[PDB]
C-alpha cells in the first residue's frame, strides 16, 4: 500500500491541543505514512518553504553566486530583529529572511520563475500575484505529499538545475545533525490568507535510509511555532526513526 | 592583532581530566590563532584517521569514489569496531572512521598520485613512505595541529587544486554536529602504532558571521578517554564564548 494512515500520531497533536498532518516517506521501502490521508493531500500557500525552490532558481540563474555572497540590509527596520542585518544564503534560509528572497524573486522575474516551477512540477505551478510575494499571498498551492515529491527530486539531484545548485541549497537547508541523524528542512508560517498554518518540510538522513517529511498544522498565533518541530519529532520517535 | 597567542588557562580543562594535550583555534575573521601550548601546537604526529579528509578528496577527484552514495563492500574480515563490519558509503565510512574502506581507496589511488596530491595540498611533511595503504597509521607522514588548520582553511574556501565538487562532498562528509547556534565539520583520529599514542579532533565551527578552525591532540594511553577529544575542545569553545 503506497500510503498508510496511522491515527495514533494524533495523540501528539492532541497532547499540544493542536490539529494538523505529518507525512513520512520511507525512501528505501517507497512507502508513505500519515495521521490524515485527506489533509496530507490538501494544498496550501507554501510561505517560507518556497525558499527552497527560490534558492535553487536564484543559484542556477546566477542571482546568487554562492553561499558566501552578502545581501545588504535595505535599512527598513522590520518586526523580526534577525532580518535587520546583512545576510548570505545560509543565514537568509536559517532566519527565513523574506526581504532577501523578495529581491531574488524580482531579479528572477515572472517568466523564468514560471518556467522553473513547471520544470520542477512544483505544486499547482501557479505564480499569479506579485512576483515578489506570490508564495505568501498569490496563487501557488502545494500539499504535504507534493512537498515530498519535490524534496525527493532535490535529494537525488534530479531537478533540471545544476548538481552544484542542488548541493548548495541542501547545504543551506541543514538544520540539525548529531551521531543519530541529519535533518535538512525549511520552516514556513502562512499568515496573509486563511487558514493560518505552520509548515516543516525536508528529510532525516540515517546511515542506511532517508525519511522525507512534510507537516503542516493550524497556527492561529506564533506562540505554537515550536510545535512544528516538536510534533514532527514525537512522530519520528514513535516510528523509531530517531531515538 | 598578534598572529598567535598562548592561553594557559585552557590547561585547567586538560588537568580536570588528568590529561595532557593542545587545542589550537583560528579565528578566520581576525586571522588570529590561540593555543594552550605553542610548542605542542607545532609538534607533528601521525595523522591516523584525520587523513580520511585528504584521502576522501583525492579518491573523489580521481573518480575512485563516484559520489557519497557509492557502496564499498565489507571484505568479510570481522574487525574490533562492530560498525566497520558492513557495507559503507563515503558518509558512513567517515562517520565511523572505517579504515578498510580508505585502505582500498589508497591502493586504487597508488603511490605516485597520492604523493603528487599531498605535495599540491602542502599536507604536513608530504611523506607517504611506508605502505600506500597504511602510511597514515605507521608510515612517514606527520602533521602538527597548526598544519591541520592550514590545510582545513584551504578546504573551507575551496582553494585546494581538486574540483569544487570534490571539496563540497568531503565537507558534507565531515558534518558532525549542527543546531541553532553552530555547525561542526570535523574528523577524529586515534594514532596507536607509534608512540606517543594520541587522540586527534580537527575541523571547524561555522557561526552566522565567522568560522573558528580547530585542531586538538591529546595523550591517549587507552581508548577509555577518546570522548575527551570532543569534551575538552568544547570546554575551550565554551570558555572563549564561541558556543554557548
Swiss-Prot record, chain A:
It holds the Pfam family Transpeptidase. GO terms for molecular function: beta-lactamase activity; penicillin binding. The active site is at 48 (acyl-ester intermediate). A beta-lactam binds at residues 48, 51, 96, 228. It comes from Klebsiella pneumoniae. PROSITE patterns: BETA_LACTAMASE_D (PS00337). The keyword Hydrolase applies. Inhibited by avibactam, related diazabicyclooctane (DBO) derivatives and by bicyclic boronic acids, via a covalent binding to Ser-48. Inhibited by chloride, bromide and iodide ions. Not inhibited by the beta-lactamase-blocking agents, clavulanic acid or tazobactam. When OXA-48 is present in clinical isolates of K.pneumoniae, increasing chloride concentration during antibiotic treatment reduces bacterial growth. GO terms for cellular component: plasma membrane. Changing residue 48 to G: Increases thermal stability. Abolishes hydrolysis of cephalothin and decreases catalytic efficiency about 60-fold with respect to ampicillin. It catalyses: a beta-lactam + H2O = a substituted beta-amino acid. Carboxylated on the epsilon-amino group of a lysine, with the resulting carbamate functional group serving as a general base. Probably N-carboxylated at Lys-51 at neutral pH in vivo and undergoes complete N-decarboxylation, at pH 4.1, in vitro. Changing residue 48 to A: Does not alter thermal stability. Keywords: Antibiotic resistance, Hydrolase, Plasmid, Signal. Its EC number is 3.5.2.6. GO terms for biological process: antibiotic catabolic process; cell wall organization; response to antibiotic. The gene is OXA-48. The modification N6-carboxylysine is found at residue 51. It is an enzyme of class 3 (hydrolase). Induction: Expressed from an upstream promoter, P(out), in an insertion sequence IS1999. Class D beta-lactamase which confers resistance to the beta-lactam antibiotics, including amoxicillin, and moderate resistance to cephalosporins and carbapenems such as cephalothin and imipenem; in the DH10B strain of E.coli. Acts via hydrolysis of the beta-lactam ring. Has oxacillin-, cephalothin- and imipenem-hydrolyzing activities. This is Beta-lactamase OXA-48. Monomer. Dimer.
Swiss-Prot record, chain B:
One of its GO terms (biological process) is response to antibiotic. The active site is at residue 49. It catalyses: a beta-lactam + H2O = a substituted beta-amino acid. A beta-lactam binds at residues 49, 52, 97, 229. Its EC number is 3.5.2.6. InterPro entries: Bact_Transpept/Beta-Lactamase, Beta-lactam/transpept-like, Beta-lactam_class-D_AS, PCN-bd_Tpept. Induction: Expressed from an upstream promoter, P(out), in an insertion sequence IS1999. Keywords: Antibiotic resistance, Hydrolase, Plasmid, Signal. It comes from the Bacteria. The modification N6-carboxylysine is found at residue 52. Coiled coil: none annotated. One of its GO terms (cellular component) is plasma membrane. It is an enzyme of class 3 (hydrolase). Carboxylated on the epsilon-amino group of a lysine, with the resulting carbamate functional group serving as a general base. Probably N-carboxylated at Lys-52 at neutral pH in vivo and undergoes complete N-decarboxylation, at pH 4.1, in vitro. Changing residue 49 to A: Does not alter thermal stability. GO terms for molecular function: beta-lactamase activity; penicillin binding. Inhibited by avibactam, related diazabicyclooctane (DBO) derivatives and by bicyclic boronic acids, via a covalent binding to Ser-49. Inhibited by chloride, bromide and iodide ions. Not inhibited by the beta-lactamase-blocking agents, clavulanic acid or tazobactam. Changing residue 168 to A: No significant effect on catalytic efficiency with respect to ampicillin. Very little reduction in dimerization at neutral pH. Predominantly monomer at neutral pH. Slightly decreases thermal stability. Monomer. Dimer. Belongs to the class-D beta-lactamase family. Class D beta-lactamase which confers resistance to the beta-lactam antibiotics, including amoxicillin, and moderate resistance to cephalosporins and carbapenems such as cephalothin and imipenem; in the DH10B strain of E.coli. Acts via hydrolysis of the beta-lactam ring. Has oxacillin-, cephalothin- and imipenem-hydrolyzing activities. PANTHER family: BETA-LACTAMASE YBXI-RELATED (PTHR30627:SF6), PEPTIDOGLYCAN D,D-TRANSPEPTIDASE (PTHR30627). When OXA-48 is present in clinical isolates of K.pneumoniae, increasing chloride concentration during antibiotic treatment reduces bacterial growth. This is Beta-lactamase OXA-48. It comes from Klebsiella pneumoniae. The gene is OXA-48.
